[PDB]
């Protein structure tokens, strides 16, 4: 048995955590944090931008990984996260923002590296059909299979997924036990804090038909483009005013 799993029913899940070339130090810090919580996953270096998106499939086929967590950066400012089932499964593309990695000295919590977490999902994941696809992909990426020989024996942290806006809010908490007053659980945030807004869901590893479109996604470049157009608009307004003033001065 090459699965590194000792359990009655084997849920064999291997994850490939992969980063693109133009990631920032903050993006890399987020990737390192997620890799630590994933004992069945392995890190991967910068990925070529000029290549094809399904080249991630034979790359993951190379390492015997059936789940790909892909970090894609644009302009060295933006982060995009892909979750995929490597041969054929569905693929979802997110825009990641509001990143607060570990090593920020305002969390006060800690947990075992590789311990099996409690996955806290929201009621919204059970109703919307597209949120149900993301729920299964999250359960595979953060599963930490039961009998894995790299995990830890005792459970002390909970990973929570919430849907408040048209976004998914990811938080990680430590399960702290306190003796009851004549044991109850208190939670302390320990880990990465980031927001995911779903862009697209495609059947197929990194292609195929589109099964969901956001239709409300506001790109960070769209915000930038409007600012540039506003600056040009002001200049054109001043130029038009001068032309009208010269015409009326002649009159």
């Amino acid at each position: 048995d090459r699965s590194n799993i000792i359990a009655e029913r084997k849920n064999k899940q291997r994850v490939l955590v992969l980063s693109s070339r133009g990631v920032t130090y903050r993006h890399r810090h987020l990737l390192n944090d997620l890799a630590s919580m994933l004992p069945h996953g392995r890190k991967d270096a910068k990925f070529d931008t000029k290549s094809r998106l399904y080249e991630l499939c034979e790359l993951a086929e190379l390492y015997n990984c059936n789940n790909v967590l892909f970090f894609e950066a644009r302009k060295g400012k933006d982060l995009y996260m892909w979750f995929s089932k490597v041969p054929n499964g569905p693929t979802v593309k997110f825009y990641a923002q509001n990143l607060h990695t570990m090593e920020e000295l305002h969390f006060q919590g800690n947990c075992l590296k590789g311990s099996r977490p409690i996955l806290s999902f929201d009621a919204a994941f059970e109703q919307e059909p597209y949120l149900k696809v993301i729920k299964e992909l999250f359960l595979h990426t953060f599963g930490v299979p039961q009998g894995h020989k790299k995990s830890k024996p005792f459970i002390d942290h909970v990973l929570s997924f919430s849907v408040a806006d048209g976004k998914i809010w990811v938080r990680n908490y430590e399960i702290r036990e306190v003796e009851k007053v004549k044991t109850d659980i208190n939670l302390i945030e320990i880990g990465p804090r980031f927001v995911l807004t779903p862009i697209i869901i495609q059947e197929g590893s990194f292609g195929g038909p589109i099964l969901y479109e956001n239709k409300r996604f506001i790109s960070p470049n769209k915000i930038r483009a409007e600012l540039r157009k506003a600056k040009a608009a002001r200049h054109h307004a001043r130029m038009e005013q001068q032309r009208d003033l010269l015409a009326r001065k002649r009159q």
Binding site: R228, K229, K231, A232, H235, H236, M239
Partner: protein, 117 residues
């Protein structure tokens, strides 16, 4: 904002009128050598890149090979009769081609070309 030693790098432009006379005399020297020729070279009309300035035109570096051929001016003779040539610029639109071709025909109408020897 004087946290560095600014006093040792302070440039005073007391030679502003002196340099202007020097520049005017240098322009006169070029006219002395190129007596009937103009002291400059004919340059094309180009559009500013940015959307802030794309509604305004200016002077470019030199004329494109395509618009030089449409005018009827050979490549190797253009720098010799006072026309600047730019081999890096592309036309990409008939509007830029027509504007500079017409500019060249206007230059040819006003030209007085002397026999070689």
């Amino acid at each position: 904002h004087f946290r560095k030693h600014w006093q040792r790098r302070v440039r005073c432009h007391f030679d502003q009128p002196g340099k202007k006379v020097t520049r005017r005399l240098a322009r006169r020297a070029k006219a002395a050598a190129l007596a009937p020729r103009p002291v400059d070279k004919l340059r094309p009309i180009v559009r500013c890149p940015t959307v802030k300035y794309n509604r305004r035109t200016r002077l470019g570096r030199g004329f494109t090979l395509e618009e030089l051929k449409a005018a009827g001016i050979p490549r190797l003779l253009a720098p010799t009769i006072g026309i600047a040539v730019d081999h890096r610029r592309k036309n990409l639109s008939e509007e830029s081609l027509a504007a500079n071709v017409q500019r060249l025909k206007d230059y040819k109408a006003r030209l007085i070309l002397f026999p070689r020897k």
